[PDB]
Design an enzyme around this catalytic site. Sequence first.
Site, mmCIF file in Angstrom:
data_model
loop_
_atom_site.group_PDB
_atom_site.id
_atom_site.type_symbol
_atom_site.label_atom_id
_atom_site.label_comp_id
_atom_site.label_asym_id
_atom_site.label_seq_id
_atom_site.Cartn_x
_atom_site.Cartn_y
_atom_site.Cartn_z
ATOM 1 N N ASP A 1 1.117 -1.023 0.022
ATOM 2 C CA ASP A 1 -0.040 -0.097 -0.046
ATOM 3 C C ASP A 1 0.825 1.192 -0.069
ATOM 4 O O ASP A 1 1.564 1.518 0.906
ATOM 5 C CB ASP A 1 -0.836 -0.221 1.517
ATOM 6 C CG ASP A 1 -1.731 1.047 1.483
ATOM 7 O OD1 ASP A 1 -1.656 1.932 0.747
ATOM 8 O OD2 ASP A 1 -2.472 1.050 2.328
ATOM 9 N N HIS B 1 -3.802 -1.167 -0.723
ATOM 10 C CA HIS B 1 -4.951 -0.575 0.091
ATOM 11 C C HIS B 1 -6.046 -1.414 -0.635
ATOM 12 O O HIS B 1 -6.117 -1.888 -1.553
ATOM 13 C CB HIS B 1 -5.094 0.893 -0.396
ATOM 14 C CG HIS B 1 -5.671 1.659 0.632
ATOM 15 N ND1 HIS B 1 -4.986 1.918 1.920
ATOM 16 C CD2 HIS B 1 -6.929 2.346 0.697
ATOM 17 C CE1 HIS B 1 -6.025 3.000 2.389
ATOM 18 N NE2 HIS B 1 -6.934 2.996 1.692
#
Length: 233
Positions: free
Chosen positions: A171, A202
Amino acid sequence: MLTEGISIQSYDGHTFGALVGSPAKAPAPVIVIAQDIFGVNAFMRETVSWLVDQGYAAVCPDLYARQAPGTALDPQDERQREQAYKLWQAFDMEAGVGDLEAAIRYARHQPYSNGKVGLVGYSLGGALAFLVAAKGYVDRAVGYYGVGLEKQLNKVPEVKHPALFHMGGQDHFVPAPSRQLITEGFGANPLLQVHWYEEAGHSFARTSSSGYVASAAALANERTLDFLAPLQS
């Protein structure tokens, strides 16, 4: 989508709606779900479903009601993603913590409540989950891919109840030096747990996301459920 008729009031007087899922069998611990940046939308309905199927009740408050009540945006629609980013940029984090504190109080005393309350948040709601954990409002808090946690590390000693965080190793809201800061900082308080999922970025637990990773979603979700289970009667 929200449950019609449901209204919760924050300390400052502001009222807001929520999506509620009563439990299959009552009484049950209630989980307040802190939304991602798209409002109370299909993924929130799915999260409420998931938790009710695991024996909880759930309350997802309309945290964008201070800006635009009832916002529910489709993350696959580009114009709606642009609206979500604009709402996130204007979002008052401290007022959001306050609205979650009010939803937590509401969750403690519904007809279906067993008096225990947990909090699970995603992205924006994962950052809010850490701030709520530092305030101590819930019995257990969980944050999936909260953004900006490396800037809140001074609050680590304030956490006095368990809080669990699931973070993607890919992420890029969390580059390597931020990951190291979080790891080291959270490492000082054993009430904090942070897990890294190396092949995920994410939004890895939302099936609808291009970043969905089923193995990481499944591992994080079962850790979330094992962590919330002590709240059950």
